[PDB]
Design a protein around this ligand. Sequence first.
Ligand SMILES: NC1=N[C@@]23[C@@H](N1)[C@H](COC(=O)NCCCCCCNC(=O)c1ccc(C(=O)O)c(-c4c5ccc(=O)cc-5oc5cc(O)ccc45)c1)N=C(N)N2CCC3(O)O
Length: 818
Amino acid sequence: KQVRWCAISDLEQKKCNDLVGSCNVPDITLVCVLRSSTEDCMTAIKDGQADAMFLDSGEVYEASKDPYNLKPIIAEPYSSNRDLQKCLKERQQALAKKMIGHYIPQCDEKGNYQPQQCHGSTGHCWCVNAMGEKISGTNTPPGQTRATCERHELPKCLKERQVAFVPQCDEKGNYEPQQFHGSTGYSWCVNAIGEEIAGTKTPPGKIPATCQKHDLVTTCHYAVAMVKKSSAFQFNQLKGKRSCHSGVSKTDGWKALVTVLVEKKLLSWDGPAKESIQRAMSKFFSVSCIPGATQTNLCKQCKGEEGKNCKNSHDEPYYGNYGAFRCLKEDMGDVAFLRSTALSDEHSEVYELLCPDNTRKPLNKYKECNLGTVPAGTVVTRKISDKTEDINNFLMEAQKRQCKLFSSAHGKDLMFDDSTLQLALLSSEVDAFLYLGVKLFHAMKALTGDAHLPSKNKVRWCTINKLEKMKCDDWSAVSGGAIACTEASCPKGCVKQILKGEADAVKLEVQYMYEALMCGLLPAVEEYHNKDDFGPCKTPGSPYTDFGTLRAVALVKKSNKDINWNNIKGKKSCHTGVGDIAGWVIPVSLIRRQNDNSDIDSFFGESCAPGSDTKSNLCKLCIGDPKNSAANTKCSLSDKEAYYGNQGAFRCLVEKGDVAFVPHTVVFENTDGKNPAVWAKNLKSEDFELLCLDGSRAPVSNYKSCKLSGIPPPAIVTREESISDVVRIVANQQSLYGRKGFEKDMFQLFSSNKGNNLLFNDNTQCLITFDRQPKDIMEDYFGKPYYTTVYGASRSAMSSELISACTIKHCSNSLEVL
Ligand SMILES: NC1=N[C@@]23[C@@H](N1)[C@H](COC(=O)NCCCCCCNC(=O)c1ccc(C(=O)O)c(-c4c5ccc(=O)cc-5oc5cc(O)ccc45)c1)N=C(N)N2CCC3(O)O
């Protein structure tokens, strides 16, 4: 009902009051809370005095910690080579605007961009590629011969696959990060456009380099140092010069400059714990104006009146990018540190750029003459996110109603960056770490002084609940300084903690490994489940035969001799539940491979898969809880469904089903003599068979050959630099706390009075070290069957916020490179 925006200056207050007066959003009233600086506004948000503000990207990290605890919620989206169905989305966005006579993009029936795009209000037309980028020069006004538009959509990867080393592309035609040459055994990493990254080519038999994912994005901004052409100094002569800065906490005014200076060995500085950055900067420059600074000389060149001087606020006339430009223009500094948004061609006669290679270049060369790329600022609120919905609704309705959000007659860059075109809602999972990305988050953490000093003799294990926390505390009290404990809420949280340097290693099931392998984490050890061969556990190096890995199989009855793999369409099937690997991952992936229609909702007849749509075919004949008529527990992803789990799917097969997609074990767990006493009392394993991929049948004991696929073992993973430091300690803690260890009467690693299946699965025999083979990490872990079946041997099969945070953003002037 109400949204309070915090303004840091008088001009922002005027713009916010103008928006309150002019922008009319139904059921939401805007309120303008005035503060004197950016930090005061962050504090007012922390105290519940305000609701949301806009922060520079560099200010995000310090915003996620005491005494602020804020999180980014609303950010400007960028265009990339990963945007699928961009035309339909942009047309829907344009049609949602309460305005007449604007450009609504035109798509075809399939949903792609029509090669010719016209602006109906003006009559102008132009040509456009697959991503909607205007072909240069094709803009024609009405009454003039139109430019004939061609069809430019064939990506570079598929075009290089033709006329042919054969590159590997994904399902969308993008370059896979890892390229493997078939003629000569070589592996390397490539750019988002296919350019080979240096230092990644590896001969055969050698472990390939881990390739990182790349996304090609456009409309990037940079941190630049502007100077006047009348001056003559270069970059390595900034010592003792007068400097103008946009702000002490902004990337384009401080952080990028600090990074470049410390890498070029120009700034005499010890460390964040030994000396503050501001002291080294005060000793570096002579007199400067750096808004928000705490050293007097770094505030001498500012023009703010008494009580307004050197504040992170437009009350200081030298604050911001345009403030730093005015600082340079009025001859109070020799170099301004700002963002490429403040550049213009009207300044290309008096001003130029100061590049870190000790040369000067004109402004238009800012892509080759900068201090680094600057990510877009974001609208942040309290981490508890008690107002995110109202703020989002207000901003979205203000954008749809064409309110003056990103411009003002009172000034520039007020409330938001003027360069902003559109604000979108971020996923609730996005914190400062997910917003900045792994590398940039670690850079901010090291710059602020929170960089963890790694210890090569202590492993920080990450837990997912209080029971695992208790077991880990036992292990830490009994380990003698070798094991410490961190707490998280889920395995993905532990992966995030490891990527942030807050933890060291954690155990993950297979369904969590993909993202973990996408972010550069390597499997340190793996659980061994062979309960009949202790050989590999008693002495390392013993060649293991079976790792105890489960094998997904399609179990049928000997009675029905008409169910083969090539006629499972329309048959009644049973699943353990939506999400399970052997129950609803291997079979659905296989079916989606062979049947190009790709519709499991209509593939089977009346299948029973707990967790699907209660009205769909995947939820029929599921008897949910026999003696509970006061509730409707059909298709429940819990034990309230009698056909849930391995035993539940086996009962579904026994009672009403034809085939069950289950691990190979349940057949022996509910037949023979080892069986329950309800529906499997006189059942035998010799009355069932397994369906093989070639369309034949096999006995149940033939699961090592007649199987759908194999499941990789749960992997205990860590970072690369910690690999050699983890495994050792594991061994050191296994021979003491394993199943046949020296101190197994003090703590058993694979059992606990605190709970079942804590830290590791309680049926684990031991932890075998990962033998790194010279092939792809994804392949080496999953197995080429599993890889090619589930993820199609592609790094683009899944997309999440964590994967985006582990992706390099390759800037480019356009996506026209195809
Ligand atoms: N670094 C590393 N990696 C392994 C390994 N150590 C351990 C697991 O080792 C064990 O536990 N012992 C069992 C194997 C010991 C060797 C016995 C001879 N077997 C193979 O050499 C073999 C290995 C992997 C695969 C695979 O599936 O890719 C296949 C295999 C095929 C290869 C090409 C092809 O067209 C078809 C294939 O078809 C299959 C069909 C099947 O039906 C069943 C298996 C295959 C064959 N843990 C991991 N997480 N790893 C990750 C990947 C990995 O497996 O290499």
